Scaffold this active site. Structure first.
Site, mmCIF file in Angstrom:
data_model
loop_
_atom_site.group_PDB
_atom_site.id
_atom_site.type_symbol
_atom_site.label_atom_id
_atom_site.label_comp_id
_atom_site.label_asym_id
_atom_site.label_seq_id
_atom_site.Cartn_x
_atom_site.Cartn_y
_atom_site.Cartn_z
ATOM 1 C CG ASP A 291 -1.462 -1.375 1.542
ATOM 2 O OD1 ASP A 291 -2.325 -1.872 0.789
ATOM 3 O OD2 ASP A 291 -1.017 -1.960 2.552
ATOM 4 N N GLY B 11 7.799 -6.656 6.864
ATOM 5 C CA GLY B 11 8.729 -7.767 6.946
ATOM 6 C C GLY B 11 10.013 -7.397 7.660
ATOM 7 C CB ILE C 166 5.241 -4.157 15.703
ATOM 8 C CG1 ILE C 166 4.961 -4.664 17.119
ATOM 9 C CG2 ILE C 166 4.068 -4.463 14.784
ATOM 10 C CD1 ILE C 166 4.104 -3.726 17.939
ATOM 11 C CG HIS D 169 -1.770 -5.862 12.668
ATOM 12 N ND1 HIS D 169 -2.874 -5.139 13.067
ATOM 13 C CD2 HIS D 169 -1.362 -5.311 11.501
ATOM 14 C CE1 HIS D 169 -3.123 -4.195 12.178
ATOM 15 N NE2 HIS D 169 -2.220 -4.277 11.217
ATOM 16 N N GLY E 70 -9.789 0.232 14.242
ATOM 17 C CA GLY E 70 -8.660 -0.210 13.444
ATOM 18 C C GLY E 70 -8.953 -1.486 12.681
ATOM 19 C CG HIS F 235 1.065 -8.924 9.782
ATOM 20 N ND1 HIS F 235 0.561 -7.982 10.653
ATOM 21 C CD2 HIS F 235 2.350 -9.131 10.156
ATOM 22 C CE1 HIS F 235 1.501 -7.634 11.513
ATOM 23 N NE2 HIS F 235 2.596 -8.318 11.234
ATOM 24 C CG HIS G 136 -0.949 -17.581 21.166
ATOM 25 N ND1 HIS G 136 -0.727 -18.825 20.613
ATOM 26 C CD2 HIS G 136 -1.213 -17.795 22.476
ATOM 27 C CE1 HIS G 136 -0.855 -19.750 21.549
ATOM 28 N NE2 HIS G 136 -1.148 -19.150 22.689
ATOM 29 C CD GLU G 137 1.740 -13.729 14.266
ATOM 30 O OE1 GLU G 137 2.468 -13.787 15.280
ATOM 31 O OE2 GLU G 137 2.172 -13.876 13.103
ATOM 32 C CG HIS H 212 -1.651 -9.315 18.978
ATOM 33 N ND1 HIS H 212 -1.353 -10.657 19.077
ATOM 34 C CD2 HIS H 212 -0.814 -8.682 19.833
ATOM 35 C CE1 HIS H 212 -0.381 -10.827 19.956
ATOM 36 N NE2 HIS H 212 -0.036 -9.643 20.429
ATOM 37 C CG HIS I 147 -2.149 -7.048 25.911
ATOM 38 N ND1 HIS I 147 -2.278 -7.111 24.539
ATOM 39 C CD2 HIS I 147 -0.927 -6.518 26.148
ATOM 40 C CE1 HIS I 147 -1.180 -6.639 23.974
ATOM 41 N NE2 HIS I 147 -0.344 -6.272 24.929
#
Length: 152
Positions: free
Chosen positions: A59, A65, A69, A72, A79, A85, A107-108, A111, A117
């Site tokens: 974008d 990559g 962070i 995500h 948001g 990702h 877990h990924e 977020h 959390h």
């Protein structure tokens, strides 16, 4: 009250049908722990949108990559519905290495999908990815509600 569930960009690693059932687990654990459902829906974006950014600045200039962070940020609301990702600064490696197979997706995506959390030690509650054998794959208390009814 039915919800759409899909996973854009199929990681070219194993059989589509093979990985399909695997990646589905990630959304399953998050689905069974939230007021929603997952059904077969065409690719047209709805509720959850699997977004990725690698190689060329996706974008706009940013580069995800390895240059931003780990996982995500932002949760379900404002948001974007929830974009998770995968494969950016970890890559699919041994279960005891960087990315613990598709399991990490649980877990990924936690977020983007949600935002439970907690940061509780002696468990996966922590903000960091906690290894877990696909065989004994399962989520403990707290996290089950950490996503259930998020931003609603």
């Amino acid at each position: 009250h039915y919800i759409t569930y899909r996973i854009n960009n199929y990681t070219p690693d194993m059989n589509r049908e093979d990985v399909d059932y695997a990646i589905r687990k990630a959304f399953q654990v998050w689905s069974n722990v939230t007021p929603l459902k997952f059904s077969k829906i065409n690719t047209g974006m709805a509720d959850i949108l699997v977004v990725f950014a690698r190689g060329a600045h996706g974008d706009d200039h940013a580069f995800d990559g390895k240059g931003g962070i780990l996982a995500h940020a932002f949760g379900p609301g404002s948001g974007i519905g929830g974009d998770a990702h995968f494969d950016e600064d970890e890559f699919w490696t041994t279960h005891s290495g960087g990315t613990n197979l598709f399991l990490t997706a649980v877990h990924e995506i936690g977020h983007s999908l949600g935002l439970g959390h907690s940061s509780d030690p002696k468990a996966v509650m922590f903000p960091t990815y906690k290894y877990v054998d696909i065989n004994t794959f399962r989520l403990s208390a707290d996290d089950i509600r950490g996503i259930q009814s998020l931003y609603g």
